[PDB]
Assembly symmetry: D2
Homo-oligomer: 401 residues x 4
């Protein structure tokens, strides 16, 4: 309450956008009477999202998506601000859906949820809320995948706004954010030098490039592994070396998966890995780096550092795995940078305020964030940054037509 | 003939893809009987395109998009290889359309043309050819704009393939190509230092970024001007400074337009320009930098260097303009790098070989290059580069589904 | 003991050089009978230095240069390996010199000390040890400053080797090390975004450039402030913007002192600092950023984050200070990267083994590390990195002469 | 005269420093009566050096160090400004020393010469001038090598100032200058793509790093070959890959020597070079890349492009050599960038004005440029660039002491 108060005060002074949203809507309180339910990693940052939603006059009901990572002192700071928060260090799967169930026990008008776990529970086990439910906002990718399977099978009966697709998210979340946060998680938990070390990045998309770029930034010799030749050729042009994972693994000092795939490393590769090879996953679930395969194949297994688990193999070489193969920057770092998140939230807060406005006009279909929002957030960010860009004149506006 | 022969031998050893296309189709000669007509900047590189088309068994009939000489040693080298080439020797367009007319006087099956000047002449003044004409390939942007105005007004009656849109073009043409070639044109014609000088780049798209990137590569302090906030915000994130052209112009050492616009500089800005400011256009026509406005406003006007024209203004300050405000890397450099062009051509050679195959199956509509070609060219490039990437397995291919 | 054991096991697998020194001298035990005394920041890394010295057969007697930062569990792990370690969370100034006194109470042959606090205590209060004392190694800068004041006043009567000057230290310590460790300390303690933020670096020497470089690496727009025009001119050429601290301070998001000076910021500048400006010192003592001046001028003062202290000023703007103005990467991070340290140690280990060899041959004077050591460590590093460089042939060796 | 006039007008507007030296000494004409003799590559830039010296009131007597590169229209423009210039497309070795002889036939007070060819001719064949001769300025390296062999054998009897050693030259000449000018020479003469190509830089000193840096700048994957492990280790840390020339040569697209050595490539390596490998020398004489060895070993030899000579080897692979193995940016480019040269000149103009002042005070010894000049030029450059740096205060000036 007094610590979780500070963890939020710190975050608060660096969420420029949300503060702007909170002084251009705070008075008009457009979300009064309306109650927003949400399932999301609970910590200082996501909490400021809830707090500014509340500042807009909404009744926020949160669930601790992260049972393990629930920061007690923060959840308590939220309650003392009039925000229903159902979170427990449950650890047991059973208790999660139960909390999910309790937010629905509040029949919300709008829902900003995780992986569609909340909106899907409604459409298949609790239609009560399904009626009062006016709109849904989905940031994840798993979720959007799910809330689309519904739309295609006509089972979906509420408008959804996927904010995972907008050049502003891909830029700040996927590129700059996961880029900085991934390397920060890696060096705060290992204190290894990055300069003059071979870093292998598996996958060269938004995240791959970001991680790669930042790595080059730290002085690393970057090697990129790819499956899509078009990306592989771009990596070359970017001054990097491209090779098969089978061949790269033999020289890597760090290996980072950033592909939305599985088993990016085979028993083979892992056995080629040189001694002291640190592996991290900055992509999907915990399947990019074969954790199961490591566990079995391991002769020994031990905790070396707070977030580093080491595995000694038959070859006598021992490999380290950050955050147990889970999303390294989130489960070992601070997630994304405070302002990076500020923007990823600002987008969601507008996705909600959009659902509220063009409420009815919308039909039970999953919509991609409206391009008008990106333009808005960008202008707001430039504005808080003290940057002013040129405005298109009529001679030109005409010319372009 | 003996010089133009070498200018082609040089290019020839660095067109990896076209040589691959010429030894995997050279024997099978799939373009026999077929005659390809084309309007394109005539020089060593574009000539190797014609030569490899001919290697495939085609009768190539070329027109000199660009005003050449009667004995231009390259044109003569092509003739001595059995390639009808109608080169223009004037500035006035009277003679240009005339040559355009003579390629049609050969009634071609396929056409790789410039700005649609060739395919549009057919549909509106020469329907004879319009029947034998089986397909058209359009690389430009003005052209595709034009050959679309037709399709929309149903006046188009032949399938068209726009190769201007494919991530491979945007990458190699727009980014790395114009990026390198633009700075090369600028420093071979001025020999000024780039390090520690303020470079202003107007526009931050594919070309903007590339030029920007490369400039930073040369040591310049880059300033970006933009109209689209989403791009402007990305420029900040990339470590650059963003300001209005009005404000940047006061400190620029070089100014480079890369926006598809006009009058990126007003009389105002030009008079703010410091003395010795070199301006170049790497974008559209010769209207990005107001050449007309410079000519009028100028107190003096003189040729300083082979491609630099200087204008002394009322303020006593004199500004320089590269390539008369025209596309600087093309009219002052060598166009794009040899292999950059090799790829931009390889794409077109396949666009033609596609029109030939899926010939009839296609209906008088403008099609975007088939994604299967990009994938192919990339694989071919990686292969000549000696790079091998990972192949997707079944566990994963299944997983992704 | 079981935690401090791991904190050392971790470090141990990433100290390539020291392990090499520990298997090319481990058997020969050249430091038997000899006891090494040392005053140094006590933690996992410096401990492995002591451990490998002991592996060489020396009796190591350590003092906790850092009273406050003494990691009990690590000190205890050292003791359980036969290493006298006098460290206490003393906090009281009095107890520091007392432990310094107890290592002398062991009359050492060689001394690797901190700021000359140990060798100066001998020459001015305890000449007993001054006789058995055979050699001294000085890594600091303050120390070497001091142990030179002695040599010049003939008060010094023992050979000293200053390892602070060698291109290998300046490279790994001053450049890459402090460069990475500084940004790591700053982002693990604030989780702020670095991309698209103005970073101001005061001073452009080894450390300035490194910090600058890395900052650029993270996406920041870098501004450099300098007093030596030669450096300032180099910063421009490197693509950065240079201005007076008075002017830069008005736009900085981070300010980092890296000059070996004091009051790099005046009451003035601090009052120009924008709200939320984070300040960090990566240079000398805690005087670069005027901490005293902040404390007085402050209307409020509060702890915001574990290593961030915030000061609200009369202007209502509040500024933050990392690690209380002390060396930010050391007192808020992990000091330098593990391998960076491995090399900074390897150099000292040889400085000792040099004092042992060319023991007598040397006269009571302060010597700069012998260039022969740099060459050795570099070759050892290249070797552990798996890098092989060309060997000069006779045609060339002769040619160069 | 009217062309050579413009080639000089162009250069003139981008020699900020020399213009400043020409309006802070132009009135005072401190070099009246005094005649300056000099042997230097004659072209627009070096000519502006002569012209500003003349502006200071000196009688300039120039020789065309470059017999082949003498730009007639420029030499004639100098004469029409009252400057004795002995230059001829001699081509014949005999005629060079003859012109050298004619500048001495003018008995100069000061000499800015090339490789000591002028000052050494005096001390060994023409002592007449040796008496009136008051001072000598040496910029080269060969020269300084020579004029030192004299000093050591007491044969030297006139004060010499070596401007080749000053951090300002190493910076602008060796680093940024040769760095930009080298890549410009290479891409204006080949138009090959640099991005995504392997660039091998032999030698990692001031020149090596610059070339390397810039190459990375253009998107190349850089490979560095070195003999000094300290540099090799720095290259790794800089994000590059280091290997033996024998191994790098097999994958290079460009090879650039920047070591002050010979036969950086053996018959062996040359035969490993892949087809189309372009080689350039940016270092010493024409012996870094074994031109003689190429000539012999070659099965064919032909001119491919104005500055590219190609050699087809027994293995059927043909390699290209820029500028015949000579300093590539000078003999194939424009030498260094205009302002880079402006600074390298400004330094020499002060070295002369220093010889004039502290004329007698100096004894027949070779002196390294006085650090007071570096400081001066840097301040002058910062000033023309519109940059203002902080001034050290008393609290600090005292502190530092
Ligand atoms: N760390 C974080 O906080 C964040 C993580 N992500 C995750 O990062 C992953 C990738 O993000 P994006 O780059 O935007 O996806 P993307 O589609 O833009 O890039 C994916 C690339 O991975 C490559 N790839 C697939 N399998 C591979 C394999 N076995 N080896 C090497 N390369 C392979 C593909 O060819 C593709 O180009 C996603 O799973 C996403 O959920 C997304 C946002 C933030
Ligand atoms: N030099 C060459 O060889 C090549 C030239 N181009 C030309 O470059 C131009 C742009 O190409 P791209 O960048 O890839 O398209 P793009 O759409 O990605 O770049 C356009 C950018 O310019 C900005 N912009 C428009 N007007 C502006 C103004 N008045 N001031 C500042 N910014 C402005 C837009 O907001 C946008 O971000 C086109 O005209 C194209 O034809 C394209 C390929 C190669
Ligand atoms: N944080 C760490 O772990 C490390 C810290 N250091 C410390 O960093 C400091 C600098 O190290 P170096 O850069 O190698 O010395 P340096 O001499 O190479 O750099 C110092 C620079 O500060 C500039 N400077 C002085 N006063 C200034 C002012 N008022 N404003 C702006 N610039 C100013 C000087 O012109 C000089 O170039 C030293 O005090 C050193 O002990 C050194 C190594 C590691
Ligand atoms: N192109 C131009 O206009 C200019 C050329 N130079 C020339 O560049 C050359 C080097 O300049 P710096 O870098 O300042 O000298 P440097 O000493 O700073 O760097 C030269 C490096 O070459 C390396 N080296 C020597 N032999 C080698 C071999 N066989 N293989 C691989 N590496 C080897 C050495 O370890 C040395 O560090 C000199 O000969 C100089 O005259 C200098 C300035 C301008």
């Amino acid at each position: 309450a007094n610590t979780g108060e500070m963890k939020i005060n710190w975050v608060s002074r660096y969420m420029p956008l949300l503060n702007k949203i909170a002084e251009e809507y705070s008075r008009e309180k457009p979300l009064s009477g309306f109650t927003v339910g949400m399932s999301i990693h609970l910590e200082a940052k996501t909490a400021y999202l809830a707090i500014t939603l509340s500042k807009l006059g909404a009744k926020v009901v949160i669930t601790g998506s992260n049972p393990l990572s629930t920061q007690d002192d923060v959840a308590e700071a939220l309650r003392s601000k009039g925000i229903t928060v159902y979170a427990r260090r449950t650890h047991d799967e059973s208790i999660y859906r139960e909390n999910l169930m309790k937010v629905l026990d509040e029949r919300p008008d709008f829902i900003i949820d995780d992986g569609g776990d909340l909106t899907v529970i409604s459409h298949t086990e609790r239609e009560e809320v399904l009626e009062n439910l006016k709109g849904v906002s989905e940031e994840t990718t798993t979720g959007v995948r799910r809330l689309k399977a519904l739309e295609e099978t006509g089972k979906l009966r509420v408008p959804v706004i996927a904010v995972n697709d907008s050049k502003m998210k891909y830029l700040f979340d996927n590129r700059y954010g996961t880029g900085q946060s991934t390397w920060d998680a890696i060096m705060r938990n290992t204190n290894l030098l990055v300069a003059g070390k071979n870093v292998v990045v598996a996958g060269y998309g938004w995240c791959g490039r970001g991680i790669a770029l930042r790595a080059a930034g730290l002085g690393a010799r970057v090697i990129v592994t790819e499956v899509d030749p078009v990306k592989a050729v771009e990596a070359i042009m970017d001054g990097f070396t491209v090779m098969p994972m089978k061949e790269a693994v033999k020289i890597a000092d760090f290996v980072i998966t950033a592909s939305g795939n599985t088993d990016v490393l085979s028993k083979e590769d892992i056995l080629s890995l040189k001694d002291g090879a640190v592996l991290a996953n900055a992509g999907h679930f915990n399947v990019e780096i074969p954790v199961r395969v490591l566990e079995e194949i391991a002769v020994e297994k031990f905790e070396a550092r707070p977030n580093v688990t080491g595995y000694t193999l038959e070859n006598g070489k021992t490999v380290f795995l950050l955050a147990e193969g889970r999303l390294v920057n989130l489960a070992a770092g601070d997630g994304h940078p405070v302002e990076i998140m500020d923007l990823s939230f600002a987008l969601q807060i507008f996705a909600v305020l959009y659902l509220l406005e063009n409420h009815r006009k919308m039909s039970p279909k999953v919509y991609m964030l409206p391009d008008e929002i990106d333009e808005r957030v960008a202008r707001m960010k430039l504005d808080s940054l003290g940057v002013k860009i040129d405005e298109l004149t009529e001679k030109q506006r005409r010319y372009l037509r």
